[PDB]
Amino acid sequence: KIRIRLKAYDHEAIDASARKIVETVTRTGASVVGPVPLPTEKNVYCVIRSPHKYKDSREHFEMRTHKRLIDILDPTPKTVDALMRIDLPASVDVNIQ
């Protein structure tokens, strides 16, 4: 499958990025896709703060990283350029699958 397995650092940031992508593509007037339900995961962060005997109150404090995906088909170079021209947030570390 395709589009996409990425990750972000802020739910607000990622949802704003999805919204602005939808807005710019709809303004270019190309199209939209059919969203599907899929949950997020819990990242792996259980780091200590001191090398001393901190083994009580030790494990972690989850770093909430909510991620959303938007699939797409039938490529068009115009949409390719409209989507690759710029990224407003730039904080969502997107990764290609």
């Binding site: 499958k1 599907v36 899929l38 819990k42 494990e59 972690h60 989850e62």
Partner: protein, 126 residues
């Protein structure tokens, strides 16, 4: 054309019930090539076994996600919904077996500090 939807833990399926000869053409694979366990065959036939319409109606499904059992359950739910929408009189014949509803049982959210979901770490007394 009539079309329904079936959902599972992490899988979805869309079918279009139409008359003809009984067959299951999956996304690029056939019935025996998609259900080799020989139990998912019986599971997805149960909706068509309670009411003998196995070789009477066609099944052109398109699924995505999950595994063998998940896809089997999704296709069963899709066939159940199609039978609900086509033949309302046969709806009890399918509800009596435990169909027409997606089993709420699904994968939960694993907990922190544990090995798996509902599994505490082993520790010996001292």
């Amino acid at each position: 054309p009539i079309q329904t939807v079936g959902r599972r833990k992490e899988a979805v399926v869309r079918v279009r019930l139409v008359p003809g000869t009984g067959q299951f053409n999956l996304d690029g694979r056939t019935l025996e090539n998609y259900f080799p366990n020989k139990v998912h065959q019986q599971l997805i036939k149960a909706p068509l076994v309670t009411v003998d319409r196995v070789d009477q109606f066609d099944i052109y499904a398109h699924l995505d996600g999950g595994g063998p059992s998940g896809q089997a359950g999704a296709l069963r739910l899709a066939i159940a919904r199609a039978l609900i929408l086509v033949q309302p009189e046969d709806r009890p014949a399918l509800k009596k077996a435990g169909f027409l509803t997606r089993d709420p049982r699904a994968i939960e959210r694993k907990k922190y500090g544990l090995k798996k979901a509902r599994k505490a770490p082993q520790y010996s007394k001292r």
